[PDB]
Design an enzyme around this catalytic site. Structure first.
Site, short mmCIF file in Angstrom:
data_model
loop_
_atom_site.label_atom_id
_atom_site.label_comp_id
_atom_site.label_asym_id
_atom_site.label_seq_id
_atom_site.Cartn_x
_atom_site.Cartn_y
_atom_site.Cartn_z
N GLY A 118 73.11 -46.56 1.35
CA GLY A 118 72.58 -47.11 0.41
C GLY A 118 72.88 -46.26 -0.80
CG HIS A 174 69.85 -29.96 -8.42
ND1 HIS A 174 70.02 -28.60 -7.76
CD2 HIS A 174 70.46 -30.84 -7.78
CE1 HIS A 174 70.82 -28.83 -6.85
NE2 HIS A 174 71.21 -30.15 -6.83
N1 LIG Z 1 73.90 -43.17 -5.61
C1 LIG Z 1 73.63 -42.54 -4.52
N2 LIG Z 1 72.94 -42.94 -3.59
C2 LIG Z 1 72.64 -42.30 -2.46
N3 LIG Z 1 72.90 -40.93 -2.19
C3 LIG Z 1 73.53 -40.30 -3.02
C4 LIG Z 1 74.05 -40.93 -4.37
N4 LIG Z 1 74.83 -40.00 -5.00
C5 LIG Z 1 75.11 -38.76 -4.07
N5 LIG Z 1 74.07 -38.94 -2.97
C6 LIG Z 1 73.94 -38.01 -2.12
O1 LIG Z 1 72.84 -37.00 -2.48
C7 LIG Z 1 73.03 -36.15 -1.56
C8 LIG Z 1 72.65 -34.80 -2.75
S1 LIG Z 1 73.30 -33.06 -2.10
C9 LIG Z 1 72.44 -33.12 -0.32
C10 LIG Z 1 71.18 -33.21 -0.61
C11 LIG Z 1 70.32 -32.98 0.95
N6 LIG Z 1 69.14 -33.76 0.69
C12 LIG Z 1 70.04 -31.61 0.90
O2 LIG Z 1 68.84 -31.18 0.77
O3 LIG Z 1 70.82 -30.79 1.64
C13 LIG Z 1 74.32 -35.69 -1.24
O4 LIG Z 1 74.59 -35.62 0.03
C14 LIG Z 1 74.97 -37.41 -1.88
O5 LIG Z 1 75.98 -37.79 -0.88
#
Ligand SMILES: Nc1ncnc2c1ncn2[C@@H]1O[C@H](CSCC[C@H](N)C(=O)O)[C@@H](O)[C@H]1O
Ligand SMILES: Nc1ncnc2c1ncn2[C@@H]1O[C@H](CSCC[C@H](N)C(=O)O)[C@@H](O)[C@H]1O
Lengths: 333, 333
Positions: free
Chosen positions: B224, B243
């Site tokens: 998604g 962030h």
């Molecule tokens: N438009 C979008 N839709 C869904 N997920 C996204 C996105 N843009 C970035 N992300 C995802 O959001 C994550 C943020 S970094 C990983 C965060 C993870 N919840 C943790 O705590 O380790 C990345 O894995 C990236 O793939």
């Protein structure tokens, strides 16, 4: 006293510890301190003056307040006592020194220290991608930064070392490799009965700053090579010298002092003597930086001893000061 | 509380503060920790094992003992509790994370933060000399380092956050942008009655690690774009998401949660919430690093509030943990 996961978390924190120095660098770079002399200001106000982005400059100042360089209250930042030397109106402005210690070269060489741990001990050029000369001859203003940086850094420790030094009321002090004469000048001013001799390379002594009215009739200057010989003196001084030299050169240098040393004479090796133990001390960080730059090493009291003995001297005592610098006092043995 | 000269001296010390992180980097690089598991060793012994120069490796270890990562006695260094996670046998080895946080990119961008303070807000490429992609597509092993680094860093905070999170005994948890599912997995294991949904980009969910026997029948995964919409859940989770995003996107994202949120629902924004004040906190250093990389920002409790309100939520409370991470809890307003 923590579990393996907290260990990881604590190490992640340690790994980001370089950000503080990065923030200090930026702060000194833009020179925001000058605009805090009138009193506490806002990120917006400081931004207009700097002039930079408010929200950005704010985040830098926030990290610096953690190190008590600035302080925040009611949306305003004030310059603290610790941050004061960031002011351009300071007798010894910290800017040049900060910009040098965080300069590209040191910043880069510190980053590649892993490569510097090679079993055969790689040289500077290996790690940096160039010679050190190529680096300076490539940017004129950076060469200028190191001269000013080194000059101000030393100027900041002089009065402390002049008062902490065990100096006779009369006699002659030879500042062996005394640079432009700053320390010798300060020593003369603090002990009116002393005569002084400045020794250093020709190009350096040509730019010496000893000729001030208040010390007229009390100093001479000599082009020389302390590897070969030094002038006779009741007190010899070696400040920030030995830490540049390998072990044998150091003895060679110390020996040159002993040779022309009187019975009541003494040699003062003034360096960031590294304390035994696991406690914080700036001599250790400086030592790491001379590791990174593949040139020089800071020594401990027990490490200096062998060199004094080999020079016909006895390390009588090491004298700590209110600065990172200490005075190893050697006498004829 | 000091005079202008001591200020300078204290600032010179602060300027060299990056050396610690440099030393930690080198230590993790060579992997000396693995050879300290049997007990205290000498610089010579550690050198043979690493294998590196003794006198050199010694000077690195000395600086690290100041940060209580190792400890010296009778010429031997021991691995401490804080340094334990340097061991490769650790559930969450700190090496990848250390090497990433001190990687060339961050190390370089932090160094040019002065240039990043421009009034118009320069982009990444401006400052680094390349695009971020060019950087990774230029070195395969570095791209690999960031994936592993990010994965382990998060893995280290999961159990803490799972226990600190106010989770219902039953219901469905949607980890919005939950990466490879690590956190959701940990949450499921800690609260047996929960169902879980993992949402992230297609290429990411394709590599998810949720399929373990002990949580069979309790999870599904969804490709998604949380900018457009998210799945219905009794509890939504946004960890290390906001962030990365500017202000409006964040509301857009939060709004997508509110839209598909039940009356008893809640959204948990989990980030390094920046505390007001001048006290040390890792959220501030992370914030600086996202400043340096010109991409992202860490927020305070008062800064998050406007975004919740704008999304039809009320920031009910922020919940601190034993980690740099906190949980901002938003409910339907
Ligand atoms: N438009 C979008 N839709 C869904 N997920 C996204 C996105 N843009 C970035 N992300 C995802 O959001 C994550 C943020 S970094 C990983 C965060 C993870 N919840 C943790 O705590 O380790 C990345 O894995 C990236 O793939
Ligand atoms: N072979 C040699 N003979 C004499 N002086 C030398 C030398 N090699 C280096 N030096 C000088 O030794 C100095 C060391 S750095 C400056 C140290 C100065 N006493 C201070 O505390 O600030 C330099 O100025 C350098 O020019």
């Amino acid at each position: 006293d923590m579990d393996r996961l907290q260990s990881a978390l604590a190490l992640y924190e340690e790994a980001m510890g370089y950000t503080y120095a990065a923030a200090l660098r930026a702060a000194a770079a833009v020179g925001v301190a000058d605009h805090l002399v009138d009193g506490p200001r806002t990120p917006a106000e400081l931004a207009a003056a700097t002039g930079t982005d408010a929200d950005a400059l704010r985040r830098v100042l926030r990290l610096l307040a953690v190190r008590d360089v600035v302080r925040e209250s009611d949306g305003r930042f004030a310059l603290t006592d610790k941050g004061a030397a960031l002011r351009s109106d300071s007798p010894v402005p910290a800017r040049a020194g900060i910009l040098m210690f965080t300069d590209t070269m040191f910043w880069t060489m510190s980053h590649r220290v892993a490569s510097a741990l090679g079993p055969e001990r790689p040289a500077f050029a290996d790690i940096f991608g160039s010679s050190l000369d190529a680096y300076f001859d490539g940017d004129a203003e950076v060469e200028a930064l190191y001269y000013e940086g080194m000059e101000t850094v030393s100027a900041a420790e002089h009065l402390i070392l002049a008062r902490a030094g065990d100096f006779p009321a009369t006699g002659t002090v030879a500042d062996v490799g005394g640079g432009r004469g700053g320390f010798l000048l300060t020593v003369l001013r603090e002990h009116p009965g002393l005569q002084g001799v400045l020794l250093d390379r020709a190009e350096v002594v040509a730019r010496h700053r000893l000729d001030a009215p208040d010390v007229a009739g009390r100093w001479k200057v000599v082009e020389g090579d302390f590897l070969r010989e030094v002038p006779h003196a009741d007190v010899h001084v070696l400040k920030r010298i030995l830490h540049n030299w390998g072990d044998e050169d150091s003895v060679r240098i110390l020996t040159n002092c002993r040779r022309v040393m009187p019975a009541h004479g003494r040699v003062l090796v003034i360096d960031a003597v590294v304390p035994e133990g696991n406690d914080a001390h700036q001599s250790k960080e400086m030592d790491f930086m001379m590791l990174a730059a593949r040139t020089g090493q800071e020594r401990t009291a027990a490490e200096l001893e062998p060199l004094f003995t080999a020079a016909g001297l006895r390390l009588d005592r090491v004298v700590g000061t209110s600065s990172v610098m200490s005075i190893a006092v050697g006498v004829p043995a």
